Design a protein around this motif. Structure first.
Motif, PDB file in Angstrom:
ATOM      1  N   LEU A 162       0.817  -1.285  -0.033  1.00 32.92           N
ATOM      2  CA  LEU A 162      -0.154  -0.129   0.165  1.00 32.92           C
ATOM      3  C   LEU A 162       0.766   1.245   0.062  1.00 32.92           C
ATOM      4  N   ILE A 163       1.973   1.425   1.011  1.00 31.86           N
ATOM      5  CA  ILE A 163       3.031   2.559   0.768  1.00 31.86           C
ATOM      6  C   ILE A 163       3.398   2.547  -0.507  1.00 31.86           C
ATOM      7  N   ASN A 164       4.088   1.600  -1.108  1.00 29.68           N
ATOM      8  CA  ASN A 164       4.589   1.639  -2.463  1.00 29.68           C
ATOM      9  C   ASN A 164       3.562   2.375  -3.252  1.00 29.68           C
ATOM     10  N   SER A 165       2.523   1.897  -3.391  1.00 24.75           N
ATOM     11  CA  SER A 165       1.443   2.530  -4.242  1.00 24.75           C
ATOM     12  C   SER A 165       0.978   3.831  -3.873  1.00 24.75           C
ATOM     13  N   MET A 166       0.987   4.127  -2.790  1.00 24.11           N
ATOM     14  CA  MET A 166       0.686   5.794  -2.251  1.00 24.11           C
ATOM     15  C   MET A 166       1.898   6.289  -2.640  1.00 24.11           C
ATOM     16  N   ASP A 167       3.114   6.114  -2.557  1.00 25.23           N
ATOM     17  CA  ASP A 167       4.380   6.763  -2.997  1.00 25.23           C
ATOM     18  C   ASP A 167       4.442   7.123  -4.510  1.00 25.23           C
ATOM     19  N   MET A 168       3.898   6.112  -5.309  1.00 26.06           N
ATOM     20  CA  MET A 168       3.754   6.431  -6.809  1.00 26.06           C
ATOM     21  C   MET A 168       2.439   7.243  -7.152  1.00 26.06           C
ATOM     22  N   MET A 169       1.483   7.438  -6.194  1.00 23.49           N
ATOM     23  CA  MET A 169       0.516   8.383  -6.457  1.00 23.49           C
ATOM     24  C   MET A 169       1.184   9.864  -6.041  1.00 23.49           C
ATOM     25  N   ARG A 170       1.713   9.685  -5.036  1.00 25.70           N
ATOM     26  CA  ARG A 170       2.264  11.375  -4.765  1.00 25.70           C
ATOM     27  C   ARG A 170       3.320  11.734  -5.638  1.00 25.70           C
ATOM     28  N   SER A 171       4.015  10.816  -6.402  1.00 24.20           N
ATOM     29  CA  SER A 171       5.067  11.457  -7.325  1.00 24.20           C
ATOM     30  C   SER A 171       4.321  11.746  -8.770  1.00 24.20           C
ATOM     31  N   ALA A 172       3.217  11.263  -9.005  1.00 23.72           N
ATOM     32  CA  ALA A 172       2.545  11.638 -10.236  1.00 23.72           C
ATOM     33  C   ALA A 172       1.887  12.911 -10.030  1.00 23.72           C
ATOM     34  N   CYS A 173       1.119  13.056  -8.617  1.00 26.66           N
ATOM     35  CA  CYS A 173       0.285  14.323  -8.442  1.00 26.66           C
ATOM     36  C   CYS A 173       1.120  15.649  -7.816  1.00 26.66           C
ATOM     37  N   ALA A 174       1.992  15.293  -6.840  1.00 28.21           N
ATOM     38  CA  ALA A 174       2.890  16.428  -6.131  1.00 28.21           C
ATOM     39  C   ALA A 174       3.432  17.317  -7.221  1.00 28.21           C
ATOM     40  N   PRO A 175       4.038  16.951  -8.404  1.00 29.32           N
ATOM     41  CA  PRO A 175       4.761  17.884  -9.259  1.00 29.32           C
ATOM     42  C   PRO A 175       3.737  19.058  -9.766  1.00 29.32           C
ATOM     43  N   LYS A 176       2.576  18.823  -9.895  1.00 34.45           N
ATOM     44  CA  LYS A 176       1.593  19.589 -10.379  1.00 34.45           C
ATOM     45  C   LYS A 176       0.930  20.679  -9.363  1.00 34.45           C
ATOM     46  N   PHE A 177       1.532  20.626  -8.206  1.00 39.68           N
ATOM     47  CA  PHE A 177       1.194  21.642  -7.077  1.00 39.68           C
ATOM     48  C   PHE A 177       2.337  22.218  -6.372  1.00 39.68           C
ATOM     49  N   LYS A 178       1.971  23.318  -5.853  1.00 38.07           N
ATOM     50  CA  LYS A 178       3.305  24.154  -5.077  1.00 38.07           C
ATOM     51  C   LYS A 178       3.073  23.546  -3.512  1.00 38.07           C
ATOM     52  N   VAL A 179       3.515  22.377  -3.287  1.00 33.98           N
ATOM     53  CA  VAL A 179       3.325  21.766  -2.150  1.00 33.98           C
ATOM     54  C   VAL A 179       4.722  21.329  -1.683  1.00 33.98           C
ATOM     55  N   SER A 180       4.901  21.126  -0.522  1.00 35.83           N
ATOM     56  CA  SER A 180       6.646  21.015   0.005  1.00 35.83           C
ATOM     57  C   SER A 180       6.243  19.586   0.706  1.00 35.83           C
ATOM     58  N   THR A 181       7.757  18.904   0.940  1.00 37.56           N
ATOM     59  CA  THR A 181       7.751  17.842   1.784  1.00 37.56           C
ATOM     60  C   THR A 181       6.889  18.072   2.945  1.00 37.56           C
ATOM     61  N   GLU A 182       7.182  19.011   3.748  1.00 35.08           N
ATOM     62  CA  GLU A 182       6.624  19.267   5.088  1.00 35.08           C
ATOM     63  C   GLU A 182       4.832  19.198   4.980  1.00 35.08           C
TER      64      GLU A 182
ATOM     65  N   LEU B 199       3.215  17.658   2.408  1.00 34.59           N
ATOM     66  CA  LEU B 199       2.860  16.167   2.266  1.00 34.59           C
ATOM     67  C   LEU B 199       3.008  15.114   3.035  1.00 34.59           C
ATOM     68  N   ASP B 200       4.216  15.215   3.755  1.00 28.37           N
ATOM     69  CA  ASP B 200       4.491  14.288   4.938  1.00 28.37           C
ATOM     70  C   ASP B 200       3.615  14.411   5.971  1.00 28.37           C
ATOM     71  N   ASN B 201       3.229  15.875   6.713  1.00 26.03           N
ATOM     72  CA  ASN B 201       2.378  16.053   7.598  1.00 26.03           C
ATOM     73  C   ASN B 201       1.002  15.416   7.138  1.00 26.03           C
TER      74      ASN B 201
END
Ligand code: NA
Length: 123
Positions: free
Chosen positions: A7-27, A29-31
């Protein structure tokens, strides 16, 4: 369905697909994965990107609760599946309170987290 690691691997691949489209930081996203919701419009629309990629939305920009329940049955470890489904049921009236689809996904997700922080995860 998946193990926790799968589940964690799949959610990490969803993050890497969507995060670059938005001005969001690691803090931010991790929070958010940890159930902490920054009031940031880019993070709200990131949740909508994730909801879309996860197969939980309809084309009107709303959450499809029936499809969401089916994805939880398919994808979640059995330990998380029943609690996540009860949370989705309890939180089904939240999206009708918001006109904007990023608000719908963000506040519906926050309701899921508040239902049980120990089982909540987000990509
Ligand atoms: Na429950």
């Amino acid at each position: 369905a998946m193990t926790r690691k799968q589940l964690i691997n799949s959610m990490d691949m969803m993050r890497s697909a969507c995060a670059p489209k938005f001005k969001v930081s690691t803090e931010m996203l991790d929070n958010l994965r940890g159930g902490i919701f920054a009031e940031d419009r880019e993070l709200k629309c990131y949740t909508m990107c994730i909801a879309q990629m996860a197969g939980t939305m309809n084309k009107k920009g709303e959450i499809n609760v029936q499809k969401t329940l089916a994805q939880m049955d398919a994808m979640l470890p059995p330990d998380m599946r029943d609690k996540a489904k009860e949370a989705i049921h309890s939180c089904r009236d939240v999206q009708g309170r918001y006109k904007d689809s990023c608000d719908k996904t963000f506040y519906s997700t926050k309701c899921l987290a508040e239902y049980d922080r120990d089982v909540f995860l987000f990509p």
